[PDB]
Design an enzyme around this catalytic site. Structure first.
Site, mmCIF file in Angstrom:
data_model
loop_
_atom_site.group_PDB
_atom_site.id
_atom_site.type_symbol
_atom_site.label_atom_id
_atom_site.label_comp_id
_atom_site.label_asym_id
_atom_site.label_seq_id
_atom_site.Cartn_x
_atom_site.Cartn_y
_atom_site.Cartn_z
ATOM 1 N N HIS A 43 21.022 1.535 16.800
ATOM 2 C CA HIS A 43 22.231 2.590 17.275
ATOM 3 C C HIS A 43 22.206 2.916 18.682
ATOM 4 O O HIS A 43 23.405 2.885 19.337
ATOM 5 C CB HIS A 43 22.473 3.669 16.361
ATOM 6 C CG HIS A 43 22.733 3.645 14.737
ATOM 7 N ND1 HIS A 43 22.961 4.204 14.030
ATOM 8 C CD2 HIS A 43 22.438 2.267 14.233
ATOM 9 C CE1 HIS A 43 23.056 3.868 12.783
ATOM 10 N NE2 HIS A 43 22.738 2.825 12.747
ATOM 11 N N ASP B 24 8.041 -7.285 4.547
ATOM 12 C CA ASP B 24 8.112 -8.514 3.725
ATOM 13 C C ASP B 24 9.493 -8.934 3.530
ATOM 14 O O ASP B 24 10.548 -8.111 3.649
ATOM 15 C CB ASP B 24 7.310 -8.131 2.451
ATOM 16 C CG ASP B 24 7.588 -7.194 1.802
ATOM 17 O OD1 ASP B 24 8.889 -6.532 1.977
ATOM 18 O OD2 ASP B 24 7.049 -6.649 0.894
HETATM 19 CA CA LIG Z 1 9.760 -4.317 2.195
HETATM 20 CA CA LIG Z 2 22.896 3.648 24.068
#
Ligand SMILES: [Ca+2]
Ligand SMILES: [Ca+2]
Ligand code: HEM
Ligand SMILES: *[C@@H]1O[C@H](CO)[C@@H](O[C@@H]2O[C@H](CO)[C@@H](O)[C@H](O)[C@H]2NC(C)=O)[C@H](O)[C@H]1NC(C)=O
Ligand SMILES: OC[C@H]1O[C@@H](O)[C@@H](O)[C@@H](O)[C@@H]1O
Ligand SMILES: [Mg+2]
EC number: 1.11.1.7
Length: 336
Positions: free
Chosen positions: A48, A201
């Site tokens: 973000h 994974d």
């Molecule tokens: Ca995982």
């Molecule tokens: Ca930023």
């Protein structure tokens, strides 16, 4: 080379402060080098913070955002009110304090905390770490973070603008292998996105491709699709990207080899870590980043399901041979 004040040897004196930051993060923010909520929150934060970058807005004469500049912390008063930034306040304040105490920029700190946090989760690759991003930043323009209700076209256009190909979008999503949701359906708070929320994974890629058959909660939350078993949450954007013709083949190729997944993810993250900066202007302190324990488990189709229960969406390529586990269907516990 240089030998830091605590004996640690390193390639540049700029890396020395990072050894103290590491000790602080591992002890306090990560409560003893654990792979729990803080790492998951930090991974949301890095994406973000960095994604508030838009060459398109810039070409048009508007401010497009400074990318991986730590603006999410410096200007949290603005950014944390963005719809996609909920449930981050406490983590952002925790990070604000460590950066201020060690005198490191909010932008470098976010990248460092990401690389360190991932080292605490078995299976994770060793993320590159560059230092030197300026501490100054402007608030990110709004509406630059892809949402779970967005169409694949919308997600690809936004990410494409930031500079990522459809393949890289799928690679960056490996982070959902260490994920849960707290805000899409609060009734199933911290329901994981895969059966191993503490293991980096390929389970996420495998599990999102299975036929959705279960409603894990009392009701369907925002952007919630049916998942393959109790306890597991499936978000719409993930279910769509797994099946879309522009991204299905890359998603499919991520199912069989943890090694290959890790390589691609590390590469896409290195690229996301410098949106808004020139990498040859930064200093490489990758040597400070610890290694994660290895994951030896094999990628498996869990609880009795088979390739028959996989909604194969890549025509050009046959679904890989994966190990099949025996039943019954698992019931996932909340992520820690
Ligand atoms: Ca995982
Ligand atoms: Ca930023
Ligand atoms: C295609 C874009 C993506 C969308 C639409 C998306 C959406 C979301 C949403 C809505 C949540 C649930 C958060 C909550 O309700 O608590 C979440 C969880 C998470 N996301 Fe994403 N995400 C995407 C890409 C990424 C990327 C590229 C990263 C980081 C490299 C990432 C890392 C995470 C992590 C680790 C969590 C778990 C948070 C937790 O368990 O507390 N996501 N994501
Ligand atoms: C990076 O910039 C932030 C603000 O953008 C600086 O933060 C302020 O720091 C003072 C003390 O130095 C605190 O009393 C303020 O509360 C902080 N403000 C915010 C918004 O966090 C920070 O100190 C800068 N760091 C460096 C190393 O230059
Ligand atoms: O152990 C409890 C787990 O069993 C399974 C389902 O009941 C999940 O919703 C729950 O997390
Ligand atoms: Mg069957």
């Amino acid at each position: 080379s240089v030998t830091c004040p605590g004996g640690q040897s390193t390639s540049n004196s700029q890396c020395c402060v990072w050894f103290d930051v590491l000790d602080d993060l591992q002890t306090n923010f990560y409560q003893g080098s654990k792979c729990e909520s803080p790492v998951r929150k930090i991974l949301r934060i890095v994406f973000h913070d960095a994604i508030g970058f838009s060459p398109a807005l810039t070409a048009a004469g508007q401010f497009g955002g400074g990318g991986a500049d730590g603006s999410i912390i410096a200007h949290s008063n603005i950014e944390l009110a963005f719809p996609a930034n909920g449930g981050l306040t406490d983590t952002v304040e925790a990070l604000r304090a460590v950066g201020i105490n060690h005198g490191v920029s909010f932008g470098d700190l976010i990248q460092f905390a990401t690389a360190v946090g991932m080292s605490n989760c078995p299976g994770s690759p060793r993320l590159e770490f560059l230092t030197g991003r300026s501490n100054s930043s402007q608030p990110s323009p709004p509406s630059l973070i892809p949402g779970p209700g967005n169409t694949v076209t919308a997600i690809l256009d936004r990410m494409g603008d930031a500079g990522f190909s459809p393949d890289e979008v799928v690679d960056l999503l490996a982070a959902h292998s260490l994920a849960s949701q707290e805000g899409l359906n609060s009734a199933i708070f911290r329901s994981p996105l895969d059966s191993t929320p503490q293991v980096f994974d390929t389970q996420f890629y495998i599990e999102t491709l299975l036929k959705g058959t279960t409603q894990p909660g009392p009701s369907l939350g925002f952007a919630e699709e049916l998942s393959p078993f109790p306890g597991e949450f499936r978000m719409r954007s993930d279910a769509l990207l797994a099946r879309d013709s522009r991204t299905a083949c890359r998603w499919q190729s991520m199912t069989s080899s943890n090694e290959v997944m890790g390589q691609r993810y590390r590469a896409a993250m290195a690229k996301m870590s410098v949106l808004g900066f020139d990498r040859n202007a930064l200093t490489d302190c990758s040597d400070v980043i610890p290694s994660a324990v290895s994951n030896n488990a094999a990628p498996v189709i869990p609880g009795g399901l088979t390739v028959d229960d996989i909604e194969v969406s890549c025509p050009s390529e046959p679904f890989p041979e994966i190990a099949t586990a025996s039943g019954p269907l698992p019931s996932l516990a909340p992520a820690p």
